[PDB]
Design a binder for this molecule. Structure first.
Ligand SMILES: [Ca+2]
Length: 242
């Protein structure tokens, strides 16, 4: 039935546990991420672990050698949904240069290169916009600066980093609609990509990360307070009649 929970990671477990490897991969390294990002993604529990309170915590840190570490976790090859309401409940980090995201890449990536394999950004935030999040799709002929994007601001001039909020896409054949705290803020359909190919009617895998630095967010400054935590209470996929 519509609204049935089809799949989830609720991040149950004791404080200091690793994320479940049957669900998540850790991407690693400080190269190739594009966007002039600074962070070195690691598989260390210093950058991703459960908190014992039912949350995944991804932590961006500055190391003694001046490098920044964080985590970038994906479900590639482990869980690849096609359609559904894809929702995470997240308390995002804050501060200049911090760039948290919950997003998806097409299952055919990288054999089908980006952006032909598709990318759906469910939530992105940049530190200089504590009251805003963005949702975007990238596809062939509509990618990068030409990604089809929308923005949601607030609540009541408040910072998203203050507490948990929900971020979702209601994803069906030929349509994606974005919701923050159950409120619509963006929508894209086969009809809005012009004469370009629609690449979203296929399985995608899920990604959670916190970047440090980038062309969009800019870079840490003297006000940036590290370490910063992104806390994720759950990632869920609900039946939506697809
Ligand atoms: Ca939980």
């Amino acid at each position: 039935a519509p609204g049935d929970l089809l799949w989830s990671d609720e991040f149950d477990g004791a404080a200091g546990s690793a994320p479940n490897p049957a669900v998540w991969n850790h991407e690693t390294g400080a190269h190739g991420w594009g966007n002039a990002e600074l962070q070195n993604y690691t598989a260390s529990r210093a950058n991703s672990a459960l908190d014992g309170q039912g949350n995944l915590v991804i932590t961006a840190r500055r190391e003694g050698d001046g490098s920044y570490t964080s985590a970038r976790m994906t479900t590639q090859g482990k869980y690849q949904p096609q359609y559904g309401r894809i929702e995470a409940r997240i308390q995002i980090p804050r501060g200049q240069g911090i760039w948290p995201a919950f997003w998806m890449l097409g299952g055919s990536f990288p054999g089908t290169p980006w952006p032909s394999s598709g990318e759906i950004d469910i939530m992105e935030n940049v530190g200089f916009e504590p009251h805003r999040v963005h949702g975007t799709v990238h596809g062939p002929g509509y990618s990068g600066g030409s990604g089809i994007t929308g923005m949601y601001q607030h609540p009541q001039g408040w910072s998203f980093a203050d507490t948990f909020h929900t971020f979702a896409v209601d994803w069906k054949p030929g349509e994606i609609t974005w919701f923050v705290d159950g409120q619509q803020f963006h929508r894209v359909t086969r009809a809005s990509v012009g004469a370009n190919a629609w690449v979203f009617d296929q399985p995608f895998f899920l990604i959670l990360n916190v970047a440090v630095g980038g062309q969009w967010p800019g870079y840490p400054d003297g006000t940036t307070q590290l370490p910063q935590q992104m806390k994720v209470d759950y990632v869920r996929v609900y039946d939506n009649g697809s």
